[PDB]
Amino acid sequence: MVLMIVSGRSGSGKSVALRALEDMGFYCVDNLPVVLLPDLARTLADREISAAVSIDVRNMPSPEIFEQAMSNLPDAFSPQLLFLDADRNTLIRRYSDTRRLHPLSSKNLSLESAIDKESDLLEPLRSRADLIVDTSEMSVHELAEMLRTRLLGKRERELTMVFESFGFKHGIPIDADYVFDVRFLPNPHWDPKLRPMTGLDKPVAAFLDRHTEVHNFIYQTRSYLELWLPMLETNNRSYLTVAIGCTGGKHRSVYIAEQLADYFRSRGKNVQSRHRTLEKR
Template sequence: MSTQAEPNGSDHPIEVVLVTGMSGAGRTTVANVLEDMDWYVVDNLPPQMMRPLVELVARADGALPKIAIVIDAKGRTKYTELQETISDFVDQGLSLRILYLEASDEVLVRRFESTRRPHPLQGDGTLLDGIEAERSQLETLKHRADIIVDTSDLNVHQLSAEVRKRFSDDDTPPLRLTVMSFGFKYGLPKDADHIADVRFLPNPYWIPHLRGHNGLDSDVASFVLEQNGAEEFIERYAATLSTVAEGYLHEGRGYAMIGIGCTGGKHRSVAISERVGKLLSAQTGIPVTVRHRDLGRE
């Protein structure tokens, strides 16, 4: 269950998590995932600034209800000061969760060697010297942790999934999907993960009374969707995207964009995108945003 802080009697409870642990164990990955989940992430914050930060955010009147504070050895953190700050939180009736990331010496050495960077506490010694020094400094903090995650056998995607499982709530969609209509004449969307071409359907542009309208109009949408192959394409494509979305969820991916194009991005692609978006959301339960990139072009 989430612990919450309510500094200065605020009516808006604040959820605070302190992310710490061994260098090389995955703090950056955790911070990125929490940020994608709409947490306000502060990296390398001095312990003395933790409480002022929470109090400052409280004055935002609920605009930033979830704070993740990342503490690491690179900032030369004095862990005795951090312990005192945590104790101060408790004494003041404020609560926070501590997420501690662990990994074996062998794995940490391998990770540092792969990046060709020294351990932040290594100094003139070896990698193991730095790892042992950090492990010793963090021992007391580890015992106070609410959540300990050993990342020795986890890849980036597995760690991301673990964080999402532990910190997601009903208001945090595990995956965001966007379906975007576009016109091929204006170029492909640069950030699209999938592209579908619906120029195989008759173009309403050549129907005089439909030319000045777009795929959001019922007459144009009906014309497009009643064409041979339109509904079959929509059902099969939505089913394919549902399978893809399941894979994205498994891999811990947070966002994907599907582009659906026709010639000008005003008629066919717009109507098909609207239909695919609704069907995909109904099949997966994942929020789907439908956008129309080229609808306003001349």
């Protein structure tokens, strides 16, 4: 079935996280090179007990050895990279509140410096990290609840990006996530010679390019979304949906919509574009 791994600089609540995983029901352990230990945790796999592990300065290995252990993987349990982290100031505060002894800086380093040295040694495993959830602002009560759910959803499904334009005359869809209007932008019914020519039309699309100013918004919007996009990825939405609102498909400038479905698609997104209003009712 599955292998889970935890990581992050203290304050990550990697121990608060380990609580959540037995609550999850995965197997629970503290610290070891355990390079050949997952073969014997394969005994855990014989018992059908999905697994969970944590890594820290205490469980620190050689990056070569960290990935040598990734190499020594019984595939039956598939490790799922989960790391957490936050700004030095807070992590420090949190560790401090704990009487947890230390980052074990035998070098007699200070703690703030220790926080810095730590990110370096946690850098090889934090670059291999796959799910990264910051803990910077959550008190012990707030960390656990968010964690319960995020961990709980555990959805493999990625996000099918959906772009859509419509006509308010019929109205605004019911299934989108974000609702934008651009009636203010140039009109296709304007130059009614082009009014029949849909917005998708290439020469009409040449008239769309004219307004690089509109293209400002294209970029602006493009970015606006980008900002929350990473944020969005963690949740179990199977698909992200967005609605663009015009009076008709002509003004839809689904070109733009498709240039944003193509711009996000250039970024590498799963655009599953739709122009439902264009299609027959």
